Amino acid sequence: TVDTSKLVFDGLRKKVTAMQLYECQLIDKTTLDKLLKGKKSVEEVASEIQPFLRGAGSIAGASASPKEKYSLVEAKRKKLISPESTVMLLEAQAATGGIIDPHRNEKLTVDSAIARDLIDFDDRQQIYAAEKAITGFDDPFSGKTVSVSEAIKKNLIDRETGMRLLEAQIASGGVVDPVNSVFLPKDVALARGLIDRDLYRSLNDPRDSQKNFVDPVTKKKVSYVQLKERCRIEPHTGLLLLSVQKRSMSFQGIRQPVTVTELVDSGILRPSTVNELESGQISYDEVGERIKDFLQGSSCIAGIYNETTKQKLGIYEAMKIGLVRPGTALELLEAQAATGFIVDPVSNLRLPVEEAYKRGLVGIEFKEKLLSAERAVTGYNDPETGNIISLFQAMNKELIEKGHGIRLLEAQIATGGIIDPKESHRLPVDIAYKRGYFNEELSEILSDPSDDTKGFFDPNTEENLTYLQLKERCIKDEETGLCLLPLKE
């Protein structure tokens, strides 16, 4: 026989003897005798009853990215987890072992948790009560220290919180026995009345009190197991960290970055490919590759290719030579301004109107008219409402004339689609209808070349064309991706 005084185990808060483990039916008669003989070691037995001894493991915190992690209170302050769910998850920790410090891998008492700022100030008293799920509730009538189930019956704790604690414990192994400081399986806990039949029954009914927790992001009622199925296990510490989406990922639009959430709202990105990108399964550059013509549109008529001298040159520079009339040059430049940037085909630069003027890409005779056309990408100021509207809406409210407005619209459609002036990206023609940046009774008009729609000019054949008709007559520089209009003489 071995030293029976050394046959002790480490429970949640107390030491646990081998005899207590046998009484609590955690070990069998065979295991117990082998401990008293030496056939089995204390460490060998403890390795097989770990979820009953210290719990299977609760949600220790959050993890936005696979490397760096956050605690429940940190993720709340970074707005990754709602304040409401933050309390409930902290209640679960205190009821299944204690408040977890994920950055030091420890089980802390509520006192120690306050000392390390792991718990906020307002949620202080609520977690003290949840801690008693393991310590026990002092009944002022009987004089006994009772479990949560009895604390609910004795009205020592509200039913709501009590159901959360019981749910969290069961998902961690079973029902906690406070006096023994050890987890008991559900079947044996029912037999000795450690948990009431009625409470346990309402704990298995999805229409009663089965789900007592709430989602971190949304406000949907969820179970503790469902949240655990959404957790990552840290390789080093073995902790259970809830996978939260920090998001905040965007692609550069015309003037400003466009959130990935906006892209799925505009129908640019399928939701299946977004969180697949958030998880890191696919690459960032490949996603932005597909939606290239939605972020900042297709290439416009960027310049002119003089076939006589075999030279690439900007539109404004072509006018100085006499390759194009000032009338033709102006509408082509404002078409560029209405699509985002003024382009220099030889230097492959894409600049706003102001910066284009500073570098000689645009003269002073076109500066004002081009600044006005640039409002088609940033918005038109409505003199009545005081806020910015779109190109299409500015046309209907007679802020700009129809002829000028039509040529700018078809310029946007020919280079990706209608420009959203508040999100700074190209919309699908169906989304533009919903937000009112275009009209279905106008898409068919601009589709087929009509009398009113041919507001552009081809210097080669001297005929009036739509922007699409003229763009189809252009060629492409393989190293710039720009459309150049071939010219002779």
Author numbering: 1960 to 2448
What does the paper say about this structure?
The cytosolic armadillo proteins plakoglobin and plakophilins interact with desmosomal cadherins and with desmoplakin (DP), a member of the plakin family of cytolinkers. The 912 amino acid C-terminal region (DPCT) binds to intermediate filaments (IFs), including keratins, vimentin and desmin. DPCT contains three plakin repeat domains (PRDs), designated PRD-A, PRD-B, and PRD-C, which share ~30% sequence identity with each other.
We determined the crystal structure of PRD-AB consisting of residues 1960–2248 at 2.6 Å resolution. There is one copy in the asymmetric unit, consistent with size exclusion chromatography indicating that it is a monomer in solution. The two domains are arranged in a “beads on a string” manner to form an elongated structure with approximate overall molecular dimensions 38 Å × 42 Å × 108 Å. The two domains are connected by a 4 amino acid linker (residues 2204–2207) but do not form any direct contacts (interatomic distance < 4 Å) with one another. In fact, the amino acids comprising the linker have higher temperature factors than nearby residues and do not form direct contacts with either domain. The envelope clearly showed that there are two domains but, in contrast to linear arrangement of domains A and B in the crystal structure, the SAXS envelope revealed a bent conformation.
